[PDB]
Design a protein around this ligand. Structure first.
Ligand SMILES: CCCCCCCC(=O)OC[C@H](COP(=O)(O)O[C@@H]1[C@H](O)[C@H](O)[C@@H](OP(=O)(O)O)[C@H](OP(=O)(O)O)[C@H]1O)OC(=O)CCCCCCC
Ligand SMILES: CCCCCCCC(=O)OC[C@H](COP(=O)(O)O[C@@H]1[C@H](O)[C@H](O)[C@@H](OP(=O)(O)O)[C@H](OP(=O)(O)O)[C@H]1O)OC(=O)CCCCCCC
Ligand SMILES: CC(C)CCC[C@@H](C)[C@H]1CC[C@H]2[C@@H]3CC=C4C[C@@H](O)CC[C@]4(C)[C@H]3CC[C@]12C
Ligand SMILES: CC(C)CCC[C@@H](C)[C@H]1CC[C@H]2[C@@H]3CC=C4C[C@@H](O)CC[C@]4(C)[C@H]3CC[C@]12C
Ligand SMILES: CC(C)CCC[C@@H](C)[C@H]1CC[C@H]2[C@@H]3CC=C4C[C@@H](O)CC[C@]4(C)[C@H]3CC[C@]12C
Ligand SMILES: CC(C)CCC[C@@H](C)[C@H]1CC[C@H]2[C@@H]3CC=C4C[C@@H](O)CC[C@]4(C)[C@H]3CC[C@]12C
Ligand SMILES: *[C@@H]1O[C@H](CO)[C@@H](O)[C@H](O)[C@H]1NC(C)=O
Ligand SMILES: *[C@@H]1O[C@H](CO)[C@@H](O)[C@H](O)[C@H]1NC(C)=O
Lengths: 517, 40, 517, 40
């Protein structure tokens, strides 16, 4: 699918012919309870980050873009991607680097006295031009140069970031309500508690730990030998919904203690009615838009395109590995085109652009993965799951009474479960574990029986330095340069690694399909 | 829109149609140039 | 060892000749860090129940017998049993049925206006007479009629009781400090908090869960393939001390929140200086002791002898199974003689009599068990561990600053770990788990491949009814009749079971050494 | 002992020695009876 045809829009046409014949199967393959369980999982797994990022965006942009706009954009883009995409298992939503770019662009517009939302409109206008040129010239064929090295480094780094943020949210909850001998029993609760409250942080920790424990125990029960096999697999598929329901009920039966809940806007309205409407004029809302900024928007549009391209294409590489039993094909050109086009269109309506997030899409693929008698058997590849997730995200405003009783701590345990389960398929994580094992306990794999132990440990340690460098870049104001540093690993793999490792060693350690050279 | 917005000569559908037409013209020019190259 | 020689004190002499030749090995075999880790484990595992039972006894007997007397009796009896016993792995300490008997005897003495401690002195005097007659006539040979049926039923019931009490203590902690919106910040703390306090119950639950989680993770790390084998086994042996230290430090760094700690008496003094001294006159302290109660003390002494005999002999049967790789021998006559004699002697000093408790002795045996490459390899059978445990129990008063900073919640997690680890060697627990498994997943064991699945499930369900009956008796005022109902299982095994099961089925299901008939 | 205790004719060592002697006599009588039985 990554070959270069040489024909204008050749990759786009091939991706359409690859997947659209399977459209009838993409509806009938969802007739299983595992698909419904995956829908319930991904609904929360996409709604909670959407709510958090919308709140942060509203705080950092004076509510020009907020929770409601992000939710509506997520719903529309998810529906259109599920109906028309070539890899429907990808989950389309907001991400951290996008929030960093929004912060930087808002600061730039505030410094120069520019309208932030109109600048976003012009960037999205420049986004549509860039993606069509890439699709026309089959620019997505460059993804074939991203080997398992960069993919696994990026996946491990993103999982570590997800776990770190999940723990840091609990740390922030503990800081907001510290353990003290005395508390003020008269503290205002609207809109948020203005002072420390008893039993809050400890109950949040208990709920998070219980959610994680129940999720892990039900995941083990799926592979366990207990109960009849059909009922056992049915319970194991619904493990995350069962854990969420149990912990939500546990928190519900504790009336006196306060726990932070999910918050959604009252209705389908703009976050700031005094700032902008549903349609933003490209010529300017309050002041006339400068001519020079219309042409100067290409460079931020270039950065956005680079970020979205790297995120979506690496996520597609991860979810479409041959070892994951993907027997329906993926379209790199079509999915990128749809994502960037939907982002550019949503820019016109004052809505944030999205990208195929690694954690959510990997969790969606794993939730649809059927395990054989250990060995992956098949994947429930269908369009119904993503469409239903997007519909439920859009309807999240209308189901506020249901969402208002769901604590964030249960969602934190769910996030921790997703983070720990996203490391199963990464060989980098496995080789990191081999650093703490005797050589005789190493599994019978091509990169152990054909490569010396110290050579393999050195190869793993080289990736660890890359992980440390990527982590340092994230913790700096220049965090938008992360895609470039990630790309810089490809010259390391293709040039510097052969200077110190043999061809057979590199083939065993870095294999596209886990083969013995 | 919302509140009071500055009045422009072109409305939002008109300006977005003009921008899309300019973008389509640029894309067509680039495609024609690429078609011309790799042949002579 | 259970054979009847026909000679007066024949069993006592054989037990002495069986073990005392191994006395030199019983000192040199303790030169290993696993023995020290077991000492640290059993020190807490015997001190905390001792403190709790001493407090309850002091509350229920007006401090005539309390924490200090129980601790001193435990130290003396443990030292003498480790120095002279035939099975030093047994842990000598107070138990629940003994507390129930003490409550009943205190009520009887209060009703009839009798001196409780002098009645205990006369009971202990009658205790010495009964045990010598049993040892002289080799009455301990009747233990051979207690098959794996009764042993496993008793062990499973006792483990369930231990887990139930461990959870009920946490429930009581939650009830004492419920989750409320408002609390009184000015509550007196001496001697105990007179009102609910914030963050108390939740932190206790967190500490207990963390202790249990760390203990289980370190136990898995012992069998894991990580780290060098020597360091891995060293860490795994010290798993309980490491977990206790970690959780104690975690609670120590939380200054503001209050957690209940270990409480020991200030010094080696009687609990009630106005009631009795160190030596209690058998003729009476305040009033002259009646003549009739001197002869009438035999029946309560008979009940105490029955309780102690059943507890100690069944515990010895459990810890000395052939499948546990006990290659040094056990003496049923000598250990019972020593225990009952020490109880009778300690009765004269106003100290409680003890018995070989099942949970503590099983945990002590498991902590000294060395696992081969799954399969039990050997057991660190030595006298140093029990002697050091008794010495540390006696010195617990002198190390109050160390014990005063140890929360009970960490000890609750330790108790839960002991309860869950005491079920490994019971075939009744395994067959209960087989009730929730398909027949094809049953392990290759003689009672599965030679017995029909429904026959095995019926045999397991018969034991479940016995467990329910024993549980009902415990929850009634007639809880002292539990040994008789437990004995009644032996006629069920030897008479009623053959009427519905074949000889081969009973040999496969009830095997003394897990053999295929 | 402690506080004020009723005075008895026999002190604690004396009474415990008497009780142990009575117990030893009873044990010896039982052992002699058992030795006599199973022989005639
Ligand atoms: C509440 C459930 C109903 C209670 C009523 C109790 C009555 C009751 O439930 O018996 C019916 C059924 C017996 O039928 P059976 O043992 O043949 O069922 C097998 C079982 O489902 C295995 O899990 C399957 O293997 P796998 O997993 O696909 O690999 C196997 O298929 P196969 O691969 O060999 O071809 C099945 O044949 O139960 C059980 O499954 C035993 C566990 C019962 C445990 C007790 C149930 C908790
Ligand atoms: C902090 C420790 C020192 C750090 C310095 C780091 C330097 C360093 O520690 O290497 C020395 C040593 C290598 O020596 P080596 O691999 O031969 O040691 C084997 C290892 O101890 C196994 O556990 C043993 O098997 P088992 O358990 O008895 O069944 C085996 O004995 P055998 O049965 O085959 O005859 C031993 O041969 O380390 C390791 O053990 C590998 C794991 C290192 C993991 C990293 C250490 C955390
Ligand atoms: C990349 C896409 C957006 C096309 C490239 C943008 C450039 C070439 C075009 C697209 C739309 C154009 C604008 C459309 C309408 C007007 C109003 C007119 O009174 C002054 C020029 C002005 C303001 C144009 C300036 C140039 C412009 C910004
Ligand atoms: C650095 C930390 C995290 C892990 C430490 C483990 C690494 C450094 C150790 C553990 C086992 C070691 C290897 C064990 C055996 C040999 C064979 C010898 O002829 C050359 C060195 C070599 C190949 C060792 C290299 C270093 C090694 C791989
Ligand atoms: C089972 C053991 C304790 C022996 C059996 C107890 C009976 C037989 C003996 C042992 C000690 C005896 C007591 C010892 C001393 C005295 C003081 C005397 O002025 C009156 C009788 C009296 C009170 C005795 C009564 C009988 C007695 C209680
Ligand atoms: C009661 C709960 C806890 C567990 C329920 C599982 C028990 C009752 C079920 C599960 C598997 C069942 C067995 C499966 C197959 C057969 C073979 C058939 O020819 C006779 C019945 C027999 C032998 C069944 C007896 C009942 C059985 C043992
Ligand atoms: C909406 O934007 C205006 C500036 O145009 C700002 O003053 C106001 O605070 C914003 N509303 C909210 C709720 O932040
Ligand atoms: C000690 O015993 C006396 C009765 O002899 C009783 O009044 C007193 O309360 C007891 N002491 C304690 C601390 O309970």
């Amino acid at each position: 699918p990554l070959q270069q045809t040489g024909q204008l829009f050749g990759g786009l046409v091939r991706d359409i012919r690859r997947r659209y014949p399977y459209y009838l199967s993409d509806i009938t393959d969802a007739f299983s309870p595992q698909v419904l369980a995956a829908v319930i999982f991904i609904y929360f797994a996409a709604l909670s980050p959407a709510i958090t990022f919308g709140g942060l965006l509203g705080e950092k942009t004076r509510n020009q873009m907020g929770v409601s706009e992000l939710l509506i954009s997520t719903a529309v883009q998810g529906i259109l991607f599920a109906l028309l995409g070539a890899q429907p298992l990808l989950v389309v939503g907001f991400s951290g680097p996008l929030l960093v770019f929004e912060e930087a662009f808002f600061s730039f517009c505030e410094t120069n006295g520019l309208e932030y939302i109109v600048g976003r409109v012009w960037i999205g206008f420049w986004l549509i031009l860039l993606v069509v040129l890439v699709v026309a010239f089959e620019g997505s064929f460059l993804v074939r140069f991203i080997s398992r090295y960069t993919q696994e480094i990026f996946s491990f780094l993103i999982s570590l970031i997800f776990i770190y943020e999940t723990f840091s949210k609990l740390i922030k909850i503990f800081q907001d309500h510290p353990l003290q001998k005395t508390y003020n029993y008269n503290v205002l609760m609207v809109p948020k508690p203005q002072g420390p409250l008893p039993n809050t942080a400890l109950l949040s920790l208990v709920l998070m730990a219980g959610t994680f424990f129940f999720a892990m125990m039900l995941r083990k029960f799926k592979n366990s030998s207990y109960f009849p096999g059909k009922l056992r697999r049915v319970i194991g598929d619904f493990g995350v919904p069962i854990s969420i329901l149990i912990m939500v009920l546990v928190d519900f039966f504790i009336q006196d203690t306060y726990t932070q809940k999910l918050s959604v806007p009252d209705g389908f309205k703009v976050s700031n009615s005094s700032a902008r409407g549903w349609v933003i004029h490209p010529l300017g809302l309050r002041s006339e838009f400068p001519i020079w900024m219309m042409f100067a928007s290409a460079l931020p549009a270039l950065l956005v395109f680079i970020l979205i391209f790297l995120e979506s294409q690496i996520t597609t590489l991860i979810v479409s590995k041959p070892e994951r039993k993907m027997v329906k094909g993926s379209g790199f050109h079509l999915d990128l085109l749809l994502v960037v086009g939907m982002g550019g269109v949503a820019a016109l309506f004052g809505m944030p652009w999205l990208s195929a997030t690694t954690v959510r899409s990997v969790t969606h693929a794993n939730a649809l993965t059927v395990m054989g008698k250990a060995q992956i058997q098949e994947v429930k590849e269908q369009r119904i799951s993503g469409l239903l997730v997007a519909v439920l995200v859009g309807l999240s405003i209308l189901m506020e009474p249901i969402l208002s009783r769901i604590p964030l701590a249960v969602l934190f345990g769910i996030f921790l479960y997703m983070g720990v389960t996203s490391l199963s398929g990464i060989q980098l994580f496995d080789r990191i574990l081999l650093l703490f094992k005797p050589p005789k306990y190493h599994p019978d794999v091509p990169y152990v029986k054909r490569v010396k132990t110290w050579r393999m440990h050195l190869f793993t340690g080289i990736q660890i330095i890359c992980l440390a460098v990527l982590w340092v870049v994230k913790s700096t104001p220049a965090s938008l340069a992360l895609p470039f540093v990630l790309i810089l690993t490809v010259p390391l793999r293709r040039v510097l690694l052969p200077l110190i490792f043999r061809n057979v060693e590199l083939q065993c350690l870095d294999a596209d399909d886990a083969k013995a050279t | 829109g919302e509140r009071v917005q500055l009045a422009h000569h072109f409305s939002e559908p008109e300006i977005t149609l003009i921008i899309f037409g300019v973008m389509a013209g640029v894309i067509g020019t680039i495609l024609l140039i690429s078609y011309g190259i790799r042949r002579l």
